Amino acid sequence: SLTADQMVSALLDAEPPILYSSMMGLLTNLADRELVHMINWAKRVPGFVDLTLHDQVHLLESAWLEILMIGLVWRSMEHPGKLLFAPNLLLDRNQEGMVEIFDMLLATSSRFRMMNLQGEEFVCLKSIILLNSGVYLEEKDHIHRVLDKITDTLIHLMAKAGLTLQQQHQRLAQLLLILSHIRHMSNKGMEHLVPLSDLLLEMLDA
Amino acid sequence: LALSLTADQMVSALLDAEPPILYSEYFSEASMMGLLTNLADRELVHMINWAKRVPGFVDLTLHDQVHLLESAWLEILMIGLVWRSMEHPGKLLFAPNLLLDRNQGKSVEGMVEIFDMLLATSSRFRMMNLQGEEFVCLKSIILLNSGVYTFTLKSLEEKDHIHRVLDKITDTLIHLMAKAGLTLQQQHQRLAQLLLILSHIRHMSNKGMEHLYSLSDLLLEMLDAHRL
Ligand SMILES: CCCN1CC[C@@H](COc2ccc([C@@H]3c4ccc(O)cc4CC4(CC4)N3C(=O)c3ccccc3)cc2)C1
Ligand SMILES: CCCN1CC[C@@H](COc2ccc([C@@H]3c4ccc(O)cc4CC4(CC4)N3C(=O)c3ccccc3)cc2)C1
Known part of the structure; x- marks a missing residue:
């Protein structure tokens, strides 16, 4: 029922912290610690907790790497030209x-700068990834109504910046089309790298 | 020219550029994959002719036309x-004479x-009553979008052109939806629903590439036509 402004506010307040840091051992350990904070960020994505724990775990499991x-x-x-994994872990391209x-992550940064992605826009993109990465009946309806509620928020945000409706649906498309590339990097990331379901549930206890 | 097209003129060109539906040869579990590979192989030739007719596509360099098609061909x-x-x-119509069900798919590793992922996308489109005009827009977006992030002054010019053309197709999808009577929220919501499905098609494509591994040269040679 939230308004677009309240949608934004809740997402911005739910942002997880930036964490601090044998290269792969460091990166695995950092990713494990971020995942915990992702779970509690997910709980605060409005509409998410309305799902069953089984659906909650399915979305997190299909989306964590993209996030x-x-x-x-x-x-x-x-x-x-660099990825800021942690504030004390800034690696460049030379860093099998x-x-x-x-290279794909860098071009994603390059695309975000080319588009001058806004923080408010970013937290909507993250929420869309959480709810959409695993949607493929009452549950789906709810997921799609919340995805729809996030669409309404991205348009509001752009209208508030003074964009014309033409520029609005154009920018919305551009933002959502980057998600395919992010899905692509996740797929390629998964290849390059007890079930995660059971760990994801356990994290949902705190 | 491509950027001066109206929405209707964009729909019209996309519909006219549509490739024909092909058939399999005139069956068993053992020959299934040979038939599907023959089909894909013939469809690809026609896919090239279709891409050359997507407005803005032949304005690109050959090398970039190849890149976009290497990236998108499976998604398409x-x-x-x-x-x-x-x-x-519950069924996939590979060709009008090659309609398969899940069980016949279980036959392969x-x-x-x-x-199951392709069947759900089909039911998802069905649930949304996807129109033919929206379909030809979605396939064009896949063509131009799927590789635009895996590419010089010249390359910057190229990507800017692609995103301009992708914007015109977005204006075209929205025009269709307003033509279909939709409100301005529903227009934005349906546009988003359609473009998020493309994420799942990418997902299918990559899982599909792993299954097929479990072409650059060919594309140039269908694209790099002489003018004789
Ligand atoms: C048993 C518990 C299971 N966990 C969960 C899976 C299992 C390892 O998952 C992991 C392991 C490492 C990562 C890092 C990481 C860390 C933090 C970050 O913010 C972002 C990333 C980005 C990422 C995803 C590409 N990555 C890399 O190094 C990288 C590789 C190639 C090119 C560029 C970057 C991410 C997830 C351990
Ligand atoms: C030099 C070129 C080399 N060729 C070009 C690539 C190389 C074969 O690639 C191929 C081989 C087969 C296919 C079919 C095919 C055919 C027609 C169609 O319209 C669509 C599809 C869809 C598809 C992609 C999932 N597929 C399957 O069978 C299938 C697998 C798992 C589940 C369900 C279906 C597509 C591409 C040989």
């Missing part, structure tokens, strides 16, 4: 099979 | 297949997973 990636890209925009995904 | 086959199958619940 770590778009968050990496978001904090790496002001660091051209890694450089292709690293 | 799949979205074509899903569209053909929309009106056959790893196939049913892709097959």
Whole structure:
């Protein structure tokens, strides 16, 4: 029922912290710690907790890598040619099979700068990834009504910046089309790298 | 020219550029994959002729036309297949004479997973009553979008052109929806629903590439036509 402004506010307040840091051992350990904070960020995505724990775990399981990636890209925009994994972990391109995904993450940062992605826009993109990455009946309806509620919020945000309706649906399309690339990097990321379901449930206890 | 097209003129060109539906040869579990590979192989030739007719596409360099098609060709086959199958619940219409069900897919190692994912996309389009004009817009977006992030001054010019053309197709999708009577919220919501499905088609494409591995040269040579 929330308004677009209240939607934004709740998402902005739910942002997880930036965490701090043998390269792959460091990156795995950092990703494990971020995942915990992702779970509690997910709880605060409005509409998410209305789902069953089984649906909650299905979405998180299908989207966690995409979420770590778009968050990496978001904090790496002001660091051209480099990924800011952690504030004490800034790697560039020279830092088997890694450089292709690293090249893809950089081009994602480059695209975010080209579009001048806004923070408000970013937290809507993350929520869309959470609810959409796994949607493929009452549950789906709800997921799609909330995805619809987030669409309404992205348009409001753009209208508030003074964009014409033409520029609004154009920018919305451009933002949602980046999600395919992020899905693509996640797929390629999964290849390059007890069930995660059971760990995801356990994290949902705190 | 492509950027001066109206929405209707964009729909019209996309519809006219549509490739024909092909058939399989005039069956068993053992020959299934040879038939599907023959089909894809012939469809690809026609896919090239279709892409050359998507407004703005031939304004690109050859090398960039190849890149876009290497990146999108499987997604385009799949979205074509899903569209053909929309009106056959539980079934994929690879060709009018090659309609397969989940069980026939179970026959191959790893196939049913892709097959269940393709079948759900088809039911999702069905639930949305996807129109033909929106379909040809979605397939064009896949063509121009799928590789635009895996590419010089010249390359910057190229990507800017692609995103301008992708904007015109977005104006065209919205024009269709307003033409279909939709309110301005529903227009934005349906546009988003359609473009999020493309994420799932990408997902299917990559899982599909792993199954097919479990072409650059060819594309240039269908694209790099002489003028004789
Ligand atoms: C048993 C518990 C299971 N966990 C869950 C899966 C299992 C390892 O998952 C992991 C392991 C490492 C990562 C990092 C990481 C960390 C933090 C970040 O913000 C972002 C990223 C980005 C990422 C995803 C591409 N990555 C890389 O290194 C990288 C590789 C190639 C090119 C560029 C970057 C992410 C997830 C351990
Ligand atoms: C030099 C070129 C080399 N060729 C070009 C690539 C190389 C074969 O690639 C191929 C081979 C087969 C296909 C079919 C096919 C055919 C027609 C169609 O319209 C759509 C599809 C969809 C598709 C992609 C999922 N598929 C399957 O069977 C299938 C698998 C798992 C579950 C369900 C279906 C598509 C591409 C040989």
